[PDB]
């Protein structure tokens, strides 16, 4: 997650402290997942071979 979240603790009564998202630092970037396309194509293939039978 590229977002740089700052911690803002605001008390709501005693001892209790809510941890809100602060103010973001840096340009907003969407979270992502990387999958090796090479590695993925064969794993998906071996399944359809086993599923064949």
């Amino acid at each position: 997650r590229p977002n740089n979240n700052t911690r803002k603790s605001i008390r709501i009564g005693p001892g209790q402290a809510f941890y809100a998202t602060g103010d973001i630092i840096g340009d907003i970037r969407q979270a992502h997942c990387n999958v090796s396309k090479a590695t993925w194509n064969e794993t998906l293939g071996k399944v359809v071979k086993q599923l064949r039978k």
Partner: antibody
Amino acid sequence: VQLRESGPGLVKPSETLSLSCTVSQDSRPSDHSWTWVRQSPGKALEWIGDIHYNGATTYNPSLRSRVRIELDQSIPRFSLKMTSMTAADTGMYYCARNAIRIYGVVALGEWFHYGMDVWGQGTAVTVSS
Amino acid sequence: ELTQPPSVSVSPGQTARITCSGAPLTSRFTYWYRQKPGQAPVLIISRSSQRSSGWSGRFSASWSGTTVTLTIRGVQADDEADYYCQSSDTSDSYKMFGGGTKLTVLG
């Protein structure tokens, strides 16, 4: 860093025209996208087609009938074609680089635009038989 | 398919105002550039990320609602040419140029 236009500069009213723009000393011209523009004799600037090293073409819908832009693969030196409509369109045409500064991940949509930063020497063309 | 004032005149050494009005002013910023007689345009303003764009080259710009503003710096001595507007569409496809201004200094 620098770039200059190239090609013939007159045309009969019919037929097509070919203009090429060579760019050199660029430290990374793959990601950067390129484009052409024009300035009518009545001092009215306009825009023509975006082109990029990926292979994405899209030109002005008011001109799509004629323009067809192509990018050469071996070395940076793209070209612009214009078919039927050519009369009065002439005046002078420029070569500019659509600067693409990227801040995130490509293919997701984090590639906001910087606009024109470096233009060509600026060549002139007129049609008049 | 946008609107730009062709002719505004203002006092030298004073601030000036350039406008460009249109609907797709939500998709891709503004841009302008300046056209000297017989020369190629140059970046008046740029964008490196989010707000840090106009800032301190001089100039500065504001975006109210339908139309945007190019609140230029205080001194306006001799920096005179023709100014246009660039920008893209809501579907990112194509770019429209809608003319622009030619300002002149008095005195």
